[PDB]
Design a protein around this motif. Structure first.
Motif, PDB file in Angstrom:
ATOM      1  N   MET A 246      -6.787  -1.573  -0.813  1.00  0.00           N
ATOM      2  CA  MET A 246      -6.537  -0.294  -0.143  1.00  0.00           C
ATOM      3  C   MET A 246      -5.788   0.838  -0.846  1.00  0.00           C
ATOM      4  O   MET A 246      -5.471   1.858  -0.219  1.00  0.00           O
ATOM      5  CB  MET A 246      -5.911  -0.594   1.222  1.00  0.00           C
ATOM      6  N   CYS A 247      -5.551   0.668  -2.147  1.00  0.00           N
ATOM      7  CA  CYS A 247      -4.896   1.653  -3.009  1.00  0.00           C
ATOM      8  C   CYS A 247      -5.532   1.667  -4.378  1.00  0.00           C
ATOM      9  O   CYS A 247      -6.028   0.638  -4.829  1.00  0.00           O
ATOM     10  CB  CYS A 247      -3.441   1.301  -3.267  1.00  0.00           C
ATOM     11  N   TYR A 248      -5.484   2.818  -5.044  1.00  0.00           N
ATOM     12  CA  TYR A 248      -5.981   2.931  -6.416  1.00  0.00           C
ATOM     13  C   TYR A 248      -4.884   2.412  -7.324  1.00  0.00           C
ATOM     14  O   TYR A 248      -3.710   2.406  -6.959  1.00  0.00           O
ATOM     15  CB  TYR A 248      -6.215   4.385  -6.838  1.00  0.00           C
TER      16      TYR A 248
ATOM     17  N   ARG B 145       0.879  -1.164   0.000  1.00  0.00           N
ATOM     18  CA  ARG B 145       0.000   0.000   0.000  1.00  0.00           C
ATOM     19  C   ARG B 145       0.925   1.224   0.000  1.00  0.00           C
ATOM     20  O   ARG B 145       2.020   1.169   0.564  1.00  0.00           O
ATOM     21  CB  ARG B 145      -0.854  -0.056   1.268  1.00  0.00           C
ATOM     22  N   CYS B 146       0.512   2.315  -0.639  1.00  0.00           N
ATOM     23  CA  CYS B 146       1.350   3.526  -0.672  1.00  0.00           C
ATOM     24  C   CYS B 146       1.428   4.192   0.707  1.00  0.00           C
ATOM     25  O   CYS B 146       0.585   3.972   1.573  1.00  0.00           O
ATOM     26  CB  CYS B 146       0.813   4.535  -1.701  1.00  0.00           C
ATOM     27  N   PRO B 147       2.465   5.014   0.928  1.00  0.00           N
ATOM     28  CA  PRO B 147       2.630   5.703   2.210  1.00  0.00           C
ATOM     29  C   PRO B 147       1.398   6.519   2.592  1.00  0.00           C
ATOM     30  O   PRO B 147       0.981   6.525   3.751  1.00  0.00           O
ATOM     31  CB  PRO B 147       3.862   6.573   1.967  1.00  0.00           C
ATOM     32  N   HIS B 148       0.818   7.212   1.618  1.00  0.00           N
ATOM     33  CA  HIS B 148      -0.364   8.027   1.869  1.00  0.00           C
ATOM     34  C   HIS B 148      -1.491   7.217   2.493  1.00  0.00           C
ATOM     35  O   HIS B 148      -2.001   7.559   3.558  1.00  0.00           O
ATOM     36  CB  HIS B 148      -0.853   8.668   0.574  1.00  0.00           C
ATOM     37  N   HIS B 149      -1.884   6.128   1.839  1.00  0.00           N
ATOM     38  CA  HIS B 149      -2.962   5.304   2.378  1.00  0.00           C
ATOM     39  C   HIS B 149      -2.559   4.485   3.616  1.00  0.00           C
ATOM     40  O   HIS B 149      -3.410   4.079   4.405  1.00  0.00           O
ATOM     41  CB  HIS B 149      -3.520   4.391   1.284  1.00  0.00           C
ATOM     42  N   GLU B 150      -1.267   4.250   3.790  1.00  0.00           N
ATOM     43  CA  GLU B 150      -0.798   3.509   4.945  1.00  0.00           C
ATOM     44  C   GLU B 150      -1.089   4.327   6.201  1.00  0.00           C
ATOM     45  O   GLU B 150      -1.603   3.803   7.194  1.00  0.00           O
ATOM     46  CB  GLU B 150       0.702   3.264   4.830  1.00  0.00           C
TER      47      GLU B 150
ATOM     48  N   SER C  84      -3.902   3.890  -9.665  1.00  0.00           N
ATOM     49  CA  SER C  84      -3.163   5.119  -9.941  1.00  0.00           C
ATOM     50  C   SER C  84      -2.278   5.639  -8.812  1.00  0.00           C
ATOM     51  O   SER C  84      -1.495   6.566  -9.035  1.00  0.00           O
ATOM     52  CB  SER C  84      -4.135   6.233 -10.330  1.00  0.00           C
ATOM     53  N   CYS C  85      -2.375   5.062  -7.613  1.00  0.00           N
ATOM     54  CA  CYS C  85      -1.566   5.578  -6.509  1.00  0.00           C
ATOM     55  C   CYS C  85      -0.091   5.726  -6.875  1.00  0.00           C
ATOM     56  O   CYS C  85       0.620   4.749  -7.060  1.00  0.00           O
ATOM     57  CB  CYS C  85      -1.728   4.706  -5.263  1.00  0.00           C
ATOM     58  N   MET C  86       0.362   6.969  -6.970  1.00  0.00           N
ATOM     59  CA  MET C  86       1.750   7.233  -7.331  1.00  0.00           C
ATOM     60  C   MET C  86       2.727   6.553  -6.382  1.00  0.00           C
ATOM     61  O   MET C  86       3.786   6.116  -6.796  1.00  0.00           O
ATOM     62  CB  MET C  86       2.024   8.738  -7.346  1.00  0.00           C
ATOM     63  N   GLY C  87       2.361   6.463  -5.109  1.00  0.00           N
ATOM     64  CA  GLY C  87       3.241   5.844  -4.131  1.00  0.00           C
ATOM     65  C   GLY C  87       3.256   4.325  -4.077  1.00  0.00           C
ATOM     66  O   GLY C  87       4.001   3.748  -3.276  1.00  0.00           O
ATOM     67  N   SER C  88       2.448   3.669  -4.915  1.00  0.00           N
ATOM     68  CA  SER C  88       2.412   2.209  -4.933  1.00  0.00           C
ATOM     69  C   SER C  88       2.281   1.663  -6.363  1.00  0.00           C
ATOM     70  O   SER C  88       3.275   1.644  -7.088  1.00  0.00           O
ATOM     71  CB  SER C  88       1.285   1.681  -4.031  1.00  0.00           C
ATOM     72  N   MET C  89       1.082   1.241  -6.785  1.00  0.00           N
ATOM     73  CA  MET C  89       0.919   0.688  -8.141  1.00  0.00           C
ATOM     74  C   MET C  89       1.430   1.627  -9.221  1.00  0.00           C
ATOM     75  O   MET C  89       2.086   1.188 -10.173  1.00  0.00           O
ATOM     76  CB  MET C  89      -0.548   0.363  -8.463  1.00  0.00           C
TER      77      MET C  89
HETATM   78 ZN   LIG Z   1      -2.548   4.358  -2.192  1.00  0.00          ZN
END
Ligand SMILES: [Zn+2]
Ligand SMILES: [Ca+2]
Length: 192
Positions: free
Chosen positions: A140-142, A81-86, A144-149
């Motif tokens: 838990m992430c899109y 999961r990206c930092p933002h959603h984490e 598009s999440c720049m910080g993950s996928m």
């Molecule tokens: Zn995310």
């Protein structure tokens, strides 16, 4: 290097996944495309995934879900999961992309050797009046999440294992977490 297998395997119990035939109206929150073997869903919302078997697996059977990047160039990278959603049901690790909703028996694993994340639940046979077992997953992430996928496609691999961890079956599907699943599925099928 070594990467998690995504080879389909029905195995001893005739195991394969199924999804609701939801269509693509704008009101849908989760919809599966058989043509693309791809699930389209919204952030953190309920994703019903069905387990279909031809014979009942033994007591103690478990069902595991794990995400991997679909492209060969990104497959060795752990999906997180990206930092933002984490930065929370209190049961799932904050860095795990996939959570199970509505099951207090869900177990989460950070593999001690591969570092990959997965969530496993006890296999239960279909309830009365049903021919399949449904698990509710949440992503838990899109996509598009720049910080993950970061727009890189991912696959969810679902494996059926016995109480000792032996592989009993495997199936998989691509997943796109987006704002408008109905519209996105309809548009992606337009290429066909
Ligand atoms: Zn995310
Ligand atoms: Ca399948």
């Amino acid at each position: 290097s070594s990467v998690p297998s995504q080879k389909t395997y029905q195995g001893s119990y005739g195991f394969r996944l199924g999804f609701l035939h939801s269509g693509t109206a704008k009101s849908v929150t989760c919809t599966y495309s058989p043509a693309l073997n791809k699930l389209f869903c919204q952030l953190a919302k309920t994703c019903p995934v069905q387990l279909w078997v031809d014979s009942t697996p033994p007591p103690g059977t478990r069902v595991r879900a794990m995400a991997i990047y679909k492209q060969s160039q990104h497959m060795t990278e752990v999906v997180r999961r990206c930092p933002h959603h984490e930065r929370s049901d209190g049961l799932a690790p904050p860095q795990h992309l996939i959570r199970v909703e509505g099951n207090l028996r869900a177990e989460y694993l950070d593999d001690r050797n591969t570092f990959r994340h997965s969530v496993v639940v006890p296999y239960e046979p279909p309830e009365v009046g049903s021919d399949c077992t449904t698990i509710h997953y949440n992503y838990m992430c899109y996509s598009s999440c720049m910080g993950s996928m970061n727009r890189r496609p991912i696959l969810t691999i679902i494996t059926l294992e016995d109480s000792s961890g032996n592989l009993l079956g495997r199936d998989s599907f691509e997943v796109r977490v987006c704002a408008c699943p109905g519209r996105d599925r309809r548009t992606e099928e337009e290429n066909l």
